[PDB]
Design a protein that fits this description.
Chains: A mainly alpha (93), B alpha/beta (286), C alpha/beta (278), D mainly alpha (559), E alpha+beta (109), F mainly alpha (96)
Shape of chain F: rod-shaped
Order of helices and strands of chain B: EHEEEEHEHEEEEHHHH
Strand content of chain B: 15-25%
GO cellular component, one term (chain B): ficolin-1-rich granule lumen
Strand order of the largest sheet of chain F: 1-2
Radius of gyration of chain B: 28 Å
Oligomer: part of a larger assembly
Largest sheet of chain F: 2 strands, antiparallel
Bound molecules: zinc ion
Shape of chain B: extended
Organism (chain B): Homo sapiens (Human)
Number of helices of chain F: 1
InterPro entries (chain B): EIF3F/CSN6-like_C, JAMM/MPN+_dom, MPN, MPN_RPN7_8
Strand order of the largest sheet of chain B: 7-6-2-3-1-10
Number of helices of chain B: 7
Helix content of chain F: 40-55%
Structural class of chain F: mainly alpha
Protein name (chain B): 26S proteasome non-ATPase regulatory subunit 7
Pfam families (chain B): JAB, MitMem_reg
Strand content of chain F: 5-15%
Amino acid sequence: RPANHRQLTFEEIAKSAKITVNEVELLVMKALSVGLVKGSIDEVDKRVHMTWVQPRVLDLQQIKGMKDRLEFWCTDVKSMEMLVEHQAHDILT
Amino acid sequence: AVQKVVVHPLVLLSVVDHFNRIGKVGNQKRVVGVLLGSWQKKVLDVSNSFAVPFDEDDKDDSVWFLDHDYLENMYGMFKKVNARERIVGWYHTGPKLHKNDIAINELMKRYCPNSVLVIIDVKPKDLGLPTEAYISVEEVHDDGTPTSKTFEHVTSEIGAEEAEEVGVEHLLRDIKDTTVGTLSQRITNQVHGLKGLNSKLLDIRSYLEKVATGKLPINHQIIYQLQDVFNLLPDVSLQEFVKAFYLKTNDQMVVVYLASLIRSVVALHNLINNKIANRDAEKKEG
Amino acid sequence: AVDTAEQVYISSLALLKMLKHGRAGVPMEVMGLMLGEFVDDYTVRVIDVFAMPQSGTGVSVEAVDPVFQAKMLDMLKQTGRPEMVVGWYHSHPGFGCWLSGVDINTQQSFEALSERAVAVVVDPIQSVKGKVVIDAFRLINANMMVLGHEPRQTTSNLGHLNKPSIQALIHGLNRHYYSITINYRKNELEQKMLLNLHKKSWMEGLTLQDYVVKEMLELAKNYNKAVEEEDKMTPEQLAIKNVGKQDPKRHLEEHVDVLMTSNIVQCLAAMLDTVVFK
Amino acid sequence: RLDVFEKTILESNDVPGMLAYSLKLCMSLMQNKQFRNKVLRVLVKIYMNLEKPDFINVCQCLIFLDDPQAVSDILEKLVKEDNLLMAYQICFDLYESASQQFLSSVIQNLRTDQTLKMIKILSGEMAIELHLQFLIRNNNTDLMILKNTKDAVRNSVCHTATVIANSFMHCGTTSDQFLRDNLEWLARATNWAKFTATASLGVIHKGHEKEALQLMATYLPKDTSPGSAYQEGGGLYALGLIHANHGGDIIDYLLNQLKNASNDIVRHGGSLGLGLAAMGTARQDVYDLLKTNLYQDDAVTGEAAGLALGLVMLGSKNAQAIEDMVGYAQETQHEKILRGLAVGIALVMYGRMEEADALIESLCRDKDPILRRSGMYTVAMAYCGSGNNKAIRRLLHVAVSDVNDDVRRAAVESLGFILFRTPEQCPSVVSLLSESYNPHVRYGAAMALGICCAGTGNKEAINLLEPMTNDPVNYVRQGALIASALIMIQQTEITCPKVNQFRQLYSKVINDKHDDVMAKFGAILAQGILDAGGHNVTISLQSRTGHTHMPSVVGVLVF
Amino acid sequence: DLYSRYKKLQQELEFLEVQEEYIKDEQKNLKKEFLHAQEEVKRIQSIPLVIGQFLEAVDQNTAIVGSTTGSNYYVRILSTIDRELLKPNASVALHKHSNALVDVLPPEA
Amino acid sequence: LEEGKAGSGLRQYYLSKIEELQLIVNDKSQNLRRLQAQRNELNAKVRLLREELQLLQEQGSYVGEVVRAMDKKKVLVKVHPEGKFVVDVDKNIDIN
Ligand SMILES: [Zn+2]
């Protein structure tokens, strides 16, 4: 996913990883030592928050999924960057 | 070993002035010479050098010769005037590297443990901080090839020195310096989107080309890995700033407040004092 | 007989080893040699400059090794251009770069070898970036005191070089010597990249790289407030009152315009939120 | 519109002169020359349709319409009308006004009594001798100040100063004085100083088209071959002065001395002598040997190749001329070839207001320091005689933003060439430039008031030049001496009180050894400028003729 | 005739109208050039410096300062601060060669 | 005239109104021309101190002590750590 959507609910981990609520601690905190995610866990609502990310390999749908959400950062920023160039070029000269 | 190099405009010109030397007589190839490095630390620096007659045949694409009588005795020349200056490697103007460049470095390793080659550019064009640098190592390969000798890119940066900016920085004379704080940072911003997002489009089109053709490079894996480090924030629709929304304007909190507070009293300094000194001269004269 | 004022065309490549080899001898004085071509009487060009061994015992006429040049000229033949030697130069970092007692003794020796043998001096200290500094001179013969002692025709290229006149001892050597005009034949091809290589390396390295928040403004507010009262007491000090105190005095600067630009730094740097992002 | 205008000029009664001075007023206030001459061409028709003939109207349309077929038919009727008195006005009016290109076209169709009378008017034969006899009468010689500058006994800069100073007051008298009195002092001169002895000889001898050949035979380069080679190189440039504009039999005299003896320093004075003689004639063979002189690669001869090429091609706008000149400017290694070529491409383009702007875009935009000076002398002559606001735009931009000080100088100097029609505007626009810290701009700022206001008697220019000679820089004082000497020409103490104040200052500073030799060169020269032609002759770019004065501008811009 | 001058008089009107952007563009450049001249005087002398002892203020724009070696030096003062930090007797930093008066101690070290 | 000499004055009034308006803008320029030339002279003042510093650049400038005065205009100079000196004229302030 593009997220964020960073913090995750325990029921989602209890769905995908199909683990009980009492064992989610050992699960996600062990990944903290492995190094795939550094995200601390929010234990009030029992929601597991994520930080950084671990990339692995790639797929043909990942490149197509890239061009969708990667170049989208290129077309959105440069579009409004021209607005910074347009209006503010007069005060510079 | 060699991490980064420092290329002075003086030694880079020693490649450029030799482009006038053999450029008028021609014919093929490029300008090639041996590089004199100054190594005080892991960071590499270059002060002077000496250009040597060199040619590389096409046919015969693997043929190259340095003149080593030029390399030996002229070393004792620069060594006699400068004891610190020694040969750290070689250079050339490229623009790219033919496969024959593997044999130029391995021959001169008798002079230096690792010879760093510097690809330069006599005509500035694109895309940015010019020239280039390579280091000679052996990574073999994962596929099982026989030991592969491939030059890895070394980041190049320009640097200055005392007494060398006398004539160099004089001749331009047309530059406005800078001005730091107003135009200096904002022109970069207009370019930071340009130069930032153009390589974004150039690579994303070549990364799409991967599936099409040119595979390998797979790469692997360096491409997507640091791209996913870029993915700490995407930022995609819409900006996912719900936590950074109130913090967005909260960083602009005091910046606007002070700008409101300074312009109020700066006016009180500008407006009052101007009116005072003006009417003192204006009405008392007539 | 006929002597016309000479114009020196220096190449951007020859300018390198003038300051560079001179920097290697700092503080002590070096002895170099000028390399170029003699076109005619009223113009001269130096197309190359090379480094010569520095003398730690002091500069002498024997510091130049004749087999050093004979091995160099042979290496210049296999090099693109084998041009004949012309003249000499020496650095003088420790002072205002004037011709010393050894420089005059090596004059009659070098002017016997080559016709002109222009004496060229250079100093690092006088400036850093925006001044030519350096120096140049040419011996006018003391035997000519019987003849007319005031060359050259086409005067003010000397006369203007005779400005500032550079104190006393320097122009005190205008007896038996006359300086020479240094102009730059256009290298602008290289000089255009000289500006591009310098400014691009100085523009954020990618232009991207570079592009204490409220606290820097809490430190700035001390300059934007606590400095105000020491600034705004002066108009109450301008009130005498009235008037026993010596006037006028203008305290308006420089804090007012500094705090102006101080906001110009903080406003456009805060625009990085709106600029970079979207 | 020109329809109702025909009814306004045809209105009854008079209106005796209202059509006469309106052409003088409209010429000043008209921004676009497009329909200007269209108004003039229909006006000169109603003059002839009117009963009373008026010959001051045909004087104005002759130069502006520049129609060789129309100027041929007006005098062809005067030949049939047989009265030489009424045509005698347009006879010499066509002479002093029309340039050399228009004179060569009108002389051919007209000569095809009254036929012998038109020969000396266009060739200026009788016009020289009548003013040759004027000089010797009104000329009043004063040797006091000349001797007061002679006794300084300075080994250099003196040989050039006195021989150019006496030539001022001695114009056209042809007499020999400073040559006969001291033989040894002229022998003390050497290098290019003896070049002036045979040169200034042609100054005093300017005019007098007959004896100019056999009198100078002692300086012939081919036969004599003096020890110093620069003495024989000024004989070719000497007669070019006399032969400025109209030529003569000496065209063969220059042809005999170009192929013998001195080379290539013959081409120096030879091309300037042949180029100034062919100036305005649009000759061909002179352009042929000027191209090979452009390729001689020598720096000193490059000035003679460029300067003589703009002369001969002035008003013709040769395409291949500049193409060979500006095409050689990139790969040439010398500045002096770039200088003669700077004025060379500048001298050819004059008074167009449009065509020349195509080259102006290339000149100033280029990074060559001398070629940027070329754009200013090119934009000056192109805009000469107009107050156009498009030229002042880039004129200040190169005079300020450009780093080179010499081009800022030549930039503010272009204001005196263009604005001489209304000299009152120069003291206002060049005022703020007088406070520039660099004296290079002040040298041209003082000249801008010197060349433009020279004819005027304006005292404000004298006031602005008062602090200019007080400035610590030496050559800005010298530039103030020549400029303040141009404002006082023909004007005595009764005109402005500053006359005697400046006259005593010129001899003062030159007799003071503590003052710089540089500035005091223009001191005695400022005297001569005030004494030029024995105070008899002035220099005026604005006259009833309306044309610019080519030799004074070309001479002062080289000076 | 009155419409004639009526067509004459707007020339210097418009001629001074373009003289508005004449100065305004010129003075702001020179202003930035004067601000660039502020970096000049602040650049001099940079480093290094030598300590010296101030003796007395003789007149404007210059004052005498005793060197650390004991030899009193007469030096042109810097055009920035001529008064408050001068003081009758104080230790003021001087340049190596020029011995230029720039800044005194707080006081003091 | 009626077009006319009554209307043309109003036409001439517009120009004279703008001429006075321009004179007001010119009066705003004239006093502003002084703020330029002032700072332009101040731009020469920073260069005046630069040029004057070059006179004081080499050795600096010293302070002497005159033990005796001579009518020949040569004045003896003495520095406290150094030895006594003497120099030719040297005339700036009145000799008295
Ligand atoms: Zn020495």
